[PDB]
PDB file of C-alpha atoms and ligand atoms in Angstrom:
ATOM      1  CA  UNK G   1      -1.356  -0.230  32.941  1.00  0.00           C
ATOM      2  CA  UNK G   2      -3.640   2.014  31.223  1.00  0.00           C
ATOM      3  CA  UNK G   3      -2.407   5.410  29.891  1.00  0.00           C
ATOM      4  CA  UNK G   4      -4.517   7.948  28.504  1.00  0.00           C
ATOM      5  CA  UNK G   5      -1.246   9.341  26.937  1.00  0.00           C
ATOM      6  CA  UNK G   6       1.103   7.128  24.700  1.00  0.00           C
ATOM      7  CA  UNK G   7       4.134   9.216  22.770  1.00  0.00           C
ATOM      8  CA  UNK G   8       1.759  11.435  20.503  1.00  0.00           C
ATOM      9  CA  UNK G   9      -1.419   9.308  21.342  1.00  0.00           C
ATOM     10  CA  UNK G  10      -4.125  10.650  23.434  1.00  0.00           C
ATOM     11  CA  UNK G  11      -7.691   8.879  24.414  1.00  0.00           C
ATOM     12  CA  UNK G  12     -10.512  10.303  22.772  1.00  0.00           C
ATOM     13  CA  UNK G  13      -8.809  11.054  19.509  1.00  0.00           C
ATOM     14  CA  UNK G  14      -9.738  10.468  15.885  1.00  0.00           C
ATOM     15  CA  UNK G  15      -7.605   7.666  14.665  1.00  0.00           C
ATOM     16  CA  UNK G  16      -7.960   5.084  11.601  1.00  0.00           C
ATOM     17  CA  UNK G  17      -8.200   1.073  12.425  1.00  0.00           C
ATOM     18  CA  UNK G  18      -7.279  -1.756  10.501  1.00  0.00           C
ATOM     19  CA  UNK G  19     -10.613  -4.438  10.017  1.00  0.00           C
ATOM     20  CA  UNK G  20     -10.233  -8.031   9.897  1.00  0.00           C
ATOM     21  CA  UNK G  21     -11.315  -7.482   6.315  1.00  0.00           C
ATOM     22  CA  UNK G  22      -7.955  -5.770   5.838  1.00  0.00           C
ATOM     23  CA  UNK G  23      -9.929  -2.461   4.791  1.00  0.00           C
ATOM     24  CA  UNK G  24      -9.392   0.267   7.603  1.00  0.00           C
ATOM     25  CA  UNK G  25     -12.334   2.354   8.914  1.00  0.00           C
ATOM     26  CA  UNK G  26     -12.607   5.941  11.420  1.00  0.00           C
ATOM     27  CA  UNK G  27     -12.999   5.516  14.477  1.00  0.00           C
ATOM     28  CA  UNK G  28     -12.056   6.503  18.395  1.00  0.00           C
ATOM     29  CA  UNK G  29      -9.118   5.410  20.352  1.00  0.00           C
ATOM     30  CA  UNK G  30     -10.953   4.531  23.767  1.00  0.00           C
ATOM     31  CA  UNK G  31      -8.026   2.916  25.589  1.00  0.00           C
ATOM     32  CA  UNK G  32      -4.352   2.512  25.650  1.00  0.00           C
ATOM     33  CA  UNK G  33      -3.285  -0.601  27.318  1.00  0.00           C
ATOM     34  CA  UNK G  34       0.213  -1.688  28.727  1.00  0.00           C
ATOM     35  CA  UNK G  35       1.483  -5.150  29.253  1.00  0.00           C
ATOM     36  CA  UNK G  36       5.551  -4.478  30.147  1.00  0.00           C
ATOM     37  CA  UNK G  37       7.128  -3.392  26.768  1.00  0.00           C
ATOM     38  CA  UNK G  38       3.877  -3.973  24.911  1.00  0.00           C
ATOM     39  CA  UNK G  39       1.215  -1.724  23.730  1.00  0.00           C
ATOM     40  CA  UNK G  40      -2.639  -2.262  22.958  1.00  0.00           C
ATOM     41  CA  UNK G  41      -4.908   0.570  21.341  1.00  0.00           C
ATOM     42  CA  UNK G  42      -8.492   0.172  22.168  1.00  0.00           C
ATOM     43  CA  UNK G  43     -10.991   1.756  18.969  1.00  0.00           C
ATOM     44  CA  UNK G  44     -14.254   2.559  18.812  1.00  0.00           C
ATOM     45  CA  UNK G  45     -15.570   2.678  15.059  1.00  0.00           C
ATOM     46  CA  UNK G  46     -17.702   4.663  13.907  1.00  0.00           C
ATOM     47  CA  UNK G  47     -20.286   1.553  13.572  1.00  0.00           C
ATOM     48  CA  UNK G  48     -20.300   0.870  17.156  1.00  0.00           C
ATOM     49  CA  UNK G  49     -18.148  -2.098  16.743  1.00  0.00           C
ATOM     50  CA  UNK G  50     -14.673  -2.309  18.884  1.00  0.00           C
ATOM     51  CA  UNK G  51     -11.331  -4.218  18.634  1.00  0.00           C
ATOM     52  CA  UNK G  52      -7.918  -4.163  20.514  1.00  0.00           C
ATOM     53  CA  UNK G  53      -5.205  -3.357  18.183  1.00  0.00           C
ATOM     54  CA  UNK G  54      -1.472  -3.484  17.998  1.00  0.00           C
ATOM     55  CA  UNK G  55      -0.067  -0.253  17.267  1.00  0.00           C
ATOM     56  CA  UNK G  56       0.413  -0.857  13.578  1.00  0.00           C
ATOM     57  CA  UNK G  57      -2.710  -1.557  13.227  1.00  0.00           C
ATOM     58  CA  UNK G  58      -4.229   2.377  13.532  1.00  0.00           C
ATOM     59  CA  UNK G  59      -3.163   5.284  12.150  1.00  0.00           C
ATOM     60  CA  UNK G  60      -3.253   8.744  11.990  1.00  0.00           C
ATOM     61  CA  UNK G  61      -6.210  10.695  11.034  1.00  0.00           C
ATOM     62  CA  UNK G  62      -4.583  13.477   9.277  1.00  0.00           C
ATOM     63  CA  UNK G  63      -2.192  13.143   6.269  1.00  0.00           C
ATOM     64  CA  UNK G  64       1.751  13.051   6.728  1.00  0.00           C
ATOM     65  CA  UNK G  65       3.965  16.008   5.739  1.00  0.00           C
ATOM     66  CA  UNK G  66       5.985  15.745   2.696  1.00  0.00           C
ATOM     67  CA  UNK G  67       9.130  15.295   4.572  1.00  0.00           C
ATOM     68  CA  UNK G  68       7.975  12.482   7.026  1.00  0.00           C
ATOM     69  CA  UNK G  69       7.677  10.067   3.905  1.00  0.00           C
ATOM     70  CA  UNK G  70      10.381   8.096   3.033  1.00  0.00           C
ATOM     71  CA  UNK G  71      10.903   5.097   0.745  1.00  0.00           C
ATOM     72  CA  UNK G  72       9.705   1.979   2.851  1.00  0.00           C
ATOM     73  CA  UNK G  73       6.993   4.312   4.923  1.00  0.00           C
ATOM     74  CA  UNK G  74       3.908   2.642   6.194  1.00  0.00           C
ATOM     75  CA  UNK G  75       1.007   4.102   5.445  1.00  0.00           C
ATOM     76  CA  UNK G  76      -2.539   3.669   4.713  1.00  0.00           C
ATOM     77  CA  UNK G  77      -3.555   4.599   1.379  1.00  0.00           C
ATOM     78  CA  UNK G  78      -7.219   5.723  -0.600  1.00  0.00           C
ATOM     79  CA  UNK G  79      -7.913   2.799  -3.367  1.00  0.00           C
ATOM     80  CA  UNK G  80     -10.786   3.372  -5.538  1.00  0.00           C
ATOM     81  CA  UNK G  81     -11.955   0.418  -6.989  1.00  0.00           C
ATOM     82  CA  UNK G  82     -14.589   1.978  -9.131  1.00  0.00           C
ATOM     83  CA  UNK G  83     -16.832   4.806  -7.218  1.00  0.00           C
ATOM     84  CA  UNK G  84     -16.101   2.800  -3.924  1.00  0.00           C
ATOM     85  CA  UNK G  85     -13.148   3.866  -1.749  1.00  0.00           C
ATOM     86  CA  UNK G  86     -11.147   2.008   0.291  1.00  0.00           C
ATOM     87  CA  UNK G  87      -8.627   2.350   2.602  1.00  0.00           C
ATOM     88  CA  UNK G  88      -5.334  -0.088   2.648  1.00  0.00           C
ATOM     89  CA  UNK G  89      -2.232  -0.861   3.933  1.00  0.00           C
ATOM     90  CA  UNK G  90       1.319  -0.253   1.915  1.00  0.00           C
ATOM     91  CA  UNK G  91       4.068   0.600   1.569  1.00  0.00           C
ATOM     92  CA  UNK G  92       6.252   4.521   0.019  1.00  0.00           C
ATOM     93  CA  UNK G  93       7.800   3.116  -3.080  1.00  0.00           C
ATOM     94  CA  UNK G  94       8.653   6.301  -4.589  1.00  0.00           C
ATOM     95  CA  UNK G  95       8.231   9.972  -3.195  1.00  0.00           C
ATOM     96  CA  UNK G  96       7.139  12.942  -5.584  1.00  0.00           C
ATOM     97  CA  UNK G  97       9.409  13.789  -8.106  1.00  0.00           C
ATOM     98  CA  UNK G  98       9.608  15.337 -12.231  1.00  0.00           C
ATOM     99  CA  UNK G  99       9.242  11.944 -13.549  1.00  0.00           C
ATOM    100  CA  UNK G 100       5.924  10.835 -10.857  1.00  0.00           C
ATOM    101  CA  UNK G 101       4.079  14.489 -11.411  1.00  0.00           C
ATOM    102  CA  UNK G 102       4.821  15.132  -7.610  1.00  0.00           C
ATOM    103  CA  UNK G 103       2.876  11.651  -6.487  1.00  0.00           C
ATOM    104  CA  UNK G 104       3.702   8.893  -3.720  1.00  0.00           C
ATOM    105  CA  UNK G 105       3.383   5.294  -5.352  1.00  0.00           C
ATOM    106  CA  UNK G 106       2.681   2.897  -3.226  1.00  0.00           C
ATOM    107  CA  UNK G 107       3.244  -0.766  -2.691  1.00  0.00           C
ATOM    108  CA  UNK G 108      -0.631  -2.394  -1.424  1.00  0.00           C
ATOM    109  CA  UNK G 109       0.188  -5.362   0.825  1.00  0.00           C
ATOM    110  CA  UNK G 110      -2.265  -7.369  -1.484  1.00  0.00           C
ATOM    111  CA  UNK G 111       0.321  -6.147  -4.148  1.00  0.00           C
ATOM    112  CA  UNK G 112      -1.862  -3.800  -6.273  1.00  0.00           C
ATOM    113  CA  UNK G 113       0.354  -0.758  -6.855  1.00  0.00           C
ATOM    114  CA  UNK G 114      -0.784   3.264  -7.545  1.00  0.00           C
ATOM    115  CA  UNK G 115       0.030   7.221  -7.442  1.00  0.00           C
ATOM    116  CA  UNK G 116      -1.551   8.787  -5.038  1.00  0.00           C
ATOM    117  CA  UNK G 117      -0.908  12.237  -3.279  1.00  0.00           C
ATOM    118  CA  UNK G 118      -0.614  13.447  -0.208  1.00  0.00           C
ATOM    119  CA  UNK G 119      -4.302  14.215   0.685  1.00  0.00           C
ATOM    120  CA  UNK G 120      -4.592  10.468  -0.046  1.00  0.00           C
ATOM    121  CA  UNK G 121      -2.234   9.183   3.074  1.00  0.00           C
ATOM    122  CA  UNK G 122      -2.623   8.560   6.267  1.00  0.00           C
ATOM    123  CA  UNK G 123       0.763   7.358   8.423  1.00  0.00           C
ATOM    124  CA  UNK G 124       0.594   4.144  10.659  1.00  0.00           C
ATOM    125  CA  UNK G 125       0.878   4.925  14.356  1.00  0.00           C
ATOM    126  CA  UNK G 126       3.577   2.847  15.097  1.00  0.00           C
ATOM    127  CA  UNK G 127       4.993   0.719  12.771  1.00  0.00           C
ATOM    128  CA  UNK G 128       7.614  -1.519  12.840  1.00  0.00           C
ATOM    129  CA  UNK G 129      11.079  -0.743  12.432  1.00  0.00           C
ATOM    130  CA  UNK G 130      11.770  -3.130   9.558  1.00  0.00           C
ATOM    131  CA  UNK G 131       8.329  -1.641   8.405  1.00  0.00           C
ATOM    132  CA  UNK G 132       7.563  -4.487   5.900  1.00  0.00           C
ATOM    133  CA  UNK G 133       7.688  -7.532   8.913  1.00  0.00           C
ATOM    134  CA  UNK G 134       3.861  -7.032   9.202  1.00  0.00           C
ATOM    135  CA  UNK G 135       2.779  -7.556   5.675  1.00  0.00           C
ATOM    136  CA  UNK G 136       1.310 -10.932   6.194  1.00  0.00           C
ATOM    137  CA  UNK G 137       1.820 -12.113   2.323  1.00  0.00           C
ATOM    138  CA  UNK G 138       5.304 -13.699   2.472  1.00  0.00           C
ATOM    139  CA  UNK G 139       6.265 -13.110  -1.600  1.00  0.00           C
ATOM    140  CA  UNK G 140       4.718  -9.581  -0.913  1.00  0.00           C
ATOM    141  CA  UNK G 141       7.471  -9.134   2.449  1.00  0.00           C
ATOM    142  CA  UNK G 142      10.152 -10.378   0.609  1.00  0.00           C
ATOM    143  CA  UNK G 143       9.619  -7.978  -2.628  1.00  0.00           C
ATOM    144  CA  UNK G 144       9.508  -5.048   0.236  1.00  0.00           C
ATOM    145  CA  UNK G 145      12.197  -5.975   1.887  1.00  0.00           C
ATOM    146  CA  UNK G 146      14.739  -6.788  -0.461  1.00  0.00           C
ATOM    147  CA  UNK G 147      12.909  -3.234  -2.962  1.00  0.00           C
ATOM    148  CA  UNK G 148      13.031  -0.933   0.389  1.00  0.00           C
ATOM    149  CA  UNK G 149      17.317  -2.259   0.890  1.00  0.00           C
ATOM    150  CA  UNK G 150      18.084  -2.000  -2.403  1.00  0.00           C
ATOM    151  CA  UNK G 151      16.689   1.612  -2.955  1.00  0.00           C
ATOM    152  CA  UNK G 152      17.669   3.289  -5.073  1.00  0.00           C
ATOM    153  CA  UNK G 153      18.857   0.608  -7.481  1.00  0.00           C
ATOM    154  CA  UNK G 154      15.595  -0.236  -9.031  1.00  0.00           C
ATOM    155  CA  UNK G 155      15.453  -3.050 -11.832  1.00  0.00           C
ATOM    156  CA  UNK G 156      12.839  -2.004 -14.042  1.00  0.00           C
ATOM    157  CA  UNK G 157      11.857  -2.902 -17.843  1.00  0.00           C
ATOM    158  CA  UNK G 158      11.307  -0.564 -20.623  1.00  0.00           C
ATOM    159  CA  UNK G 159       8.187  -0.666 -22.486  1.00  0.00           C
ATOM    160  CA  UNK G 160       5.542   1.634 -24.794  1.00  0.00           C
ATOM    161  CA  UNK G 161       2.547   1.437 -26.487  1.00  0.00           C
ATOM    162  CA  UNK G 162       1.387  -1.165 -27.880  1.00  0.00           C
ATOM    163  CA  UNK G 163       3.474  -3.752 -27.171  1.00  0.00           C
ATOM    164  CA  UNK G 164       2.794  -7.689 -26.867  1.00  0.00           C
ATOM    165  CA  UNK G 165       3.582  -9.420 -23.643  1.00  0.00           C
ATOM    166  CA  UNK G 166       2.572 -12.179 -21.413  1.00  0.00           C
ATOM    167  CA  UNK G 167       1.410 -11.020 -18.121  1.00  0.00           C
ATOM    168  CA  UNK G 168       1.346 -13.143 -15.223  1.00  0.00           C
ATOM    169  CA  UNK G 169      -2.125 -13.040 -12.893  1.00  0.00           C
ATOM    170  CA  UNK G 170      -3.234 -15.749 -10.028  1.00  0.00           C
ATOM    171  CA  UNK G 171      -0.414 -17.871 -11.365  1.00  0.00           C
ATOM    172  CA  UNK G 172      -0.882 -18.172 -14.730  1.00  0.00           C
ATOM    173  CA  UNK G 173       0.522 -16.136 -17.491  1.00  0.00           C
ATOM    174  CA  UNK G 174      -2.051 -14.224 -20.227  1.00  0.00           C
ATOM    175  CA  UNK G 175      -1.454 -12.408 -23.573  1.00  0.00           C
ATOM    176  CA  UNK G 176      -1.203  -8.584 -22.756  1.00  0.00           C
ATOM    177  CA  UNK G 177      -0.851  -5.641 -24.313  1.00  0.00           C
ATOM    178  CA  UNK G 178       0.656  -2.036 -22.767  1.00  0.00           C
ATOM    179  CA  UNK G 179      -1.627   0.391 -23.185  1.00  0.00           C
ATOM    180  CA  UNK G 180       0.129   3.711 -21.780  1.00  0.00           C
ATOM    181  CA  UNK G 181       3.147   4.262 -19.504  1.00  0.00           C
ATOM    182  CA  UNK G 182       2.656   6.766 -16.196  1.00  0.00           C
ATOM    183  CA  UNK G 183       6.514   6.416 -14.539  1.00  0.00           C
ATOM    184  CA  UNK G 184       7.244   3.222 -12.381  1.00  0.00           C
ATOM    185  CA  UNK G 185       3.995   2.029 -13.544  1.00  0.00           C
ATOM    186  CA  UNK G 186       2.392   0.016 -17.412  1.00  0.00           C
ATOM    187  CA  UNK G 187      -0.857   0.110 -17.667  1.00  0.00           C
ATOM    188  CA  UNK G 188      -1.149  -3.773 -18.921  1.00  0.00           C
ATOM    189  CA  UNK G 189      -4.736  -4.679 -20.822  1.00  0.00           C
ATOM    190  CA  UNK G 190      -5.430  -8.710 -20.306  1.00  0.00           C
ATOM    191  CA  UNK G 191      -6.612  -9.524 -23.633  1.00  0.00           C
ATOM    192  CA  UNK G 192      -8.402 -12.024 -22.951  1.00  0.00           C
ATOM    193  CA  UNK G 193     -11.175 -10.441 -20.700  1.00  0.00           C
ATOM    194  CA  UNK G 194      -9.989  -6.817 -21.558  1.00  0.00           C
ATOM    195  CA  UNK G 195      -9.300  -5.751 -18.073  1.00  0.00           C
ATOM    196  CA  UNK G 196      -6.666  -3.575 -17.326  1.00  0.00           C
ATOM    197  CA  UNK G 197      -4.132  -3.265 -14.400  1.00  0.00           C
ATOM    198  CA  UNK G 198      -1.685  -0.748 -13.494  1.00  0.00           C
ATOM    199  CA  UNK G 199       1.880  -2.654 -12.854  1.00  0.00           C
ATOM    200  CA  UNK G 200       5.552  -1.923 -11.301  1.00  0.00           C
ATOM    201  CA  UNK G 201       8.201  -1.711 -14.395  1.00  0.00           C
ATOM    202  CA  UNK G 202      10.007  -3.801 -11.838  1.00  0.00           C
ATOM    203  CA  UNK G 203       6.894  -6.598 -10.975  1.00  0.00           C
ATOM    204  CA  UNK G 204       8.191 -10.276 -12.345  1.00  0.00           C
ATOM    205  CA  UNK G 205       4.852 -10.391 -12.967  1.00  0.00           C
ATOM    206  CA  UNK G 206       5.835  -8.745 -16.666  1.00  0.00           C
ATOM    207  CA  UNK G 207       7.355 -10.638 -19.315  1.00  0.00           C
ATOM    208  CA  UNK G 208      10.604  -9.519 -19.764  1.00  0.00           C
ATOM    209  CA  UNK G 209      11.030  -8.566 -16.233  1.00  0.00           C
ATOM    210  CA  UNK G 210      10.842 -12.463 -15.482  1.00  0.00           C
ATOM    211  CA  UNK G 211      13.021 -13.094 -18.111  1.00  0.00           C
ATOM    212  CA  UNK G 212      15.639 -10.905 -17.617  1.00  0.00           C
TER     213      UNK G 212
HETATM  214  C1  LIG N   1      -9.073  -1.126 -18.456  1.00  0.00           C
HETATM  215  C2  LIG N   1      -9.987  -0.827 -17.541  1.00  0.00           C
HETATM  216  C3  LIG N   1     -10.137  -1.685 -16.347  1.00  0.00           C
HETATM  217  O1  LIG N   1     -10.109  -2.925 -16.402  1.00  0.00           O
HETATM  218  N1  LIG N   1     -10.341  -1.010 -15.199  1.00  0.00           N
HETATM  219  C4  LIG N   1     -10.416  -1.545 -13.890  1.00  0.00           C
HETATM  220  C5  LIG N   1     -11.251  -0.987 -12.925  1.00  0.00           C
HETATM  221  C6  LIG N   1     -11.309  -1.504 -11.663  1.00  0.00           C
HETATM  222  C7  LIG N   1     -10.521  -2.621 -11.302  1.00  0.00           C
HETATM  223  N2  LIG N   1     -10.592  -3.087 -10.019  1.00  0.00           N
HETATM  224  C8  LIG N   1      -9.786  -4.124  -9.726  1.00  0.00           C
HETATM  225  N3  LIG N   1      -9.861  -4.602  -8.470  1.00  0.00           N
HETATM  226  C9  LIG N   1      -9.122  -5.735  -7.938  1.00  0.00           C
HETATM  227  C10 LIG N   1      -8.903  -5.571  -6.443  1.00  0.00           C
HETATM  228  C11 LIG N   1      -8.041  -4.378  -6.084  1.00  0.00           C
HETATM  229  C12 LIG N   1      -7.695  -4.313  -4.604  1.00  0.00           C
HETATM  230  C13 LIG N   1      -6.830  -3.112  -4.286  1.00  0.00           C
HETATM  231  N4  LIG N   1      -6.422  -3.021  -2.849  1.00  0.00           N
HETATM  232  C14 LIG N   1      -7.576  -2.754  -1.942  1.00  0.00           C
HETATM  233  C15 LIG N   1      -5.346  -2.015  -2.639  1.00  0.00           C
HETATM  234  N5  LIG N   1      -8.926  -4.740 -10.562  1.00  0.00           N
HETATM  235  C16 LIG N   1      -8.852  -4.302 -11.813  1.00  0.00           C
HETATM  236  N6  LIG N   1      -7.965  -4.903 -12.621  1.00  0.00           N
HETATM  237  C17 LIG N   1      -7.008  -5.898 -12.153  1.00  0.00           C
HETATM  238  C18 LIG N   1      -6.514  -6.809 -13.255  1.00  0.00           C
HETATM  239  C19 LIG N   1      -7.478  -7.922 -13.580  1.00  0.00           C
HETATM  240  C20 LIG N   1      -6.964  -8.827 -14.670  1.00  0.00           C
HETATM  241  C21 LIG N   1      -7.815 -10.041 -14.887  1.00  0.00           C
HETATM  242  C22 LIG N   1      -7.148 -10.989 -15.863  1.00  0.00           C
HETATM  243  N7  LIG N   1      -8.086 -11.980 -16.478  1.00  0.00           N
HETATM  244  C23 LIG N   1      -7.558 -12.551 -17.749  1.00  0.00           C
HETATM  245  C24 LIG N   1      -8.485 -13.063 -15.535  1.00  0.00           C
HETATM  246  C25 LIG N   1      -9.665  -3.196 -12.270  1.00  0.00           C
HETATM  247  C26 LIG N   1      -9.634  -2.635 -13.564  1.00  0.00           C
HETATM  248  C27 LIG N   1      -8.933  -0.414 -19.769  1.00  0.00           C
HETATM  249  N8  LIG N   1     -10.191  -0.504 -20.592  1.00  0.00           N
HETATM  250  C28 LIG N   1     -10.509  -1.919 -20.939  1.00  0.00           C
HETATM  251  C29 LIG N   1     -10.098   0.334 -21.823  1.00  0.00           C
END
């Protein structure tokens, strides 16, 4: 069939839509397509182009209220990789709190991590129930799944300042040094290039969190 009106949907609206770039982009929701149980969203972007999305695969143009977040929310997030913004797919790993300065981290499915606030999230039409079964990385999925169900018991290591570790990156491990602490997250500096990287306390991706 084809429905104008799906739940909280409507034809015509503003809506985000997830690229096969994995970056998602404004557009229109032109159609709404039924095949039994399943549902098809029809965008428009704003560049003319159009695809034929599942339903997690668009989200909401405005940003979600406080008390629709939850640990294990999908959600597309702003990433600024320089002066360029992007939007991406993750995952709530942590809702504001004292320790966060009232911020959301979230979990990228390409497993790059960040605070972000509100004004910086956009929920995921309809995402799955077990919300982390469309992250296509498989060692990403599993760190959701198994983070998300163990909530809140969160192994995490303790570091400061100026402290010496190896820090693992495309499968290798490199000499690292912490450069500052903000929460859940170490801001790690590669020595050997000098770039830097904002990490989960819990990632085995840090020294002593793989050898613990
Ligand atoms: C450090 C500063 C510094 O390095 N800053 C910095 C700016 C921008 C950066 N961008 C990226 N982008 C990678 C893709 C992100 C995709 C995100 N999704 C869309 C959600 N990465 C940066 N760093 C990552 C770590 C790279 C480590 C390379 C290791 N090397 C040995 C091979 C990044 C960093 C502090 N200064 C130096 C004082």
């Amino acid at each position: 069939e084809n429905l104008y009106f799906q739940g909280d949907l409507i034809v015509s609206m503003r809506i985000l839509g997830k690229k096969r770039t994995k970056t998602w982009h404004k557009g229109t929701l032109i159609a709404i397509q039924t095949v039994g149980p399943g549902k098809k969203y029809k965008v428009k972007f704003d560049n003319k182009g159009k695809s034929l999305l599942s339903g997690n695969h668009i989200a909401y143009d405005y940003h979600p209220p406080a008390d629709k977040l939850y640990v294990g929310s999908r959600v597309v997030a702003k990433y600024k990789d320089g002066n360029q913004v992007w939007l991406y797919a993750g995952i709530v790993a942590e809702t504001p709190n004292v320790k966060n300065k009232l911020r959301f981290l979230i979990f990228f499915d390409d497993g790059y991590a960040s605070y972000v606030t509100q004004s910086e999230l956009y929920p995921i039409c309809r995402p799955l129930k077990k919300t982390w079964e469309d992250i296509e990385d498989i060692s990403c999925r599993d760190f959701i799944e198994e983070y998300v169900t163990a909530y809140p018991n969160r192994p995490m290591v303790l570091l400061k300042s100026g402290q010496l570790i190896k820090t693992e990156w495309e499968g290798t491990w490199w000499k690292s040094r912490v450069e500052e602490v903000d929460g859940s997250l170490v801001r790690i500096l590669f020595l050997d290039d000098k770039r830097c990287e904002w990490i989960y306390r819990g990632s085995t991706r840090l020294e002593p969190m793989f050898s613990m």
